[PDB]
Amino acid sequence: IFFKKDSLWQSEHLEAVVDQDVQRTCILHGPVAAQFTKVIDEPIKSIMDGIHDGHIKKLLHQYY
Amino acid sequence: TYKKPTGGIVTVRSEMGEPIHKIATRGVMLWKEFDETIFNLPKNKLVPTLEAKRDYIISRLNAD
């Protein structure tokens, strides 16, 4: 329990971990989805509209 | 990911035994090591293992 309990928040507050060391923390991340995570601080809008603009542009090309 | 870190992510056991994909950081590698060595052990044989490895466990916890 002492080891495992409440091991989520720390990734989002290094100032409350020892040495502000990321490498101590747990960061939850999909093995498959880690292939597409490349651009740091890309505005949520940019990413979510980027995907939607992809899907429209291809769909329009293929069925209209 | 179940056996070894695969593309930098690894599977570790939760508190209830549910798997979780996290980044293979030193903290999560220790977490996996203690899932394979300590936490898996039957309740009776837990306590003798904790004194047996006390100095090892502490040096890891304070490091990683």
Could you tell me if A3 lies within 8 Å of chain B, comparing CB atoms? yes
User: Contact, B43 vs B34, CB < 8 A?
Assistant: no
Which of A1, A4, A29 is facing B21, going by the closest CB pair? Answer: A29
Resolution in A: 3.4
CB atoms within 10 A of CB B16: 6
User: Contact, B61 vs A4, CB < 8 A?
Assistant: no
Could you tell me if A29 lies within 8 Å of chain B, comparing CB atoms? yes
- Per DSSP, chain A holds a count of helices (H) and strands (E) of 1, 0
d(CA A55, CA A53) in angstroms, rounded, equals: 6
Residue among B27, B22, B23 nearest B61 (CA): B27
d(CA A60, CA B44) in angstroms, rounded, equals: 65
- φ, ψ of residue B40 to 5 degrees: the values are -70, -20
Could you tell me if B17 lies within 8 Å of chain A, comparing CB atoms? no
* Distance in Å, alpha carbon of B26 to nearest chain A alpha carbon: 6
Could you tell me if A25 lies within 8 Å of chain B, comparing CB atoms? yes
Contacts A27 to B, Cβ<8 Å = 22-23, 25
Token pair of A46, please? 């940019």
Please give the method by which this entry was determined: cryo-EM
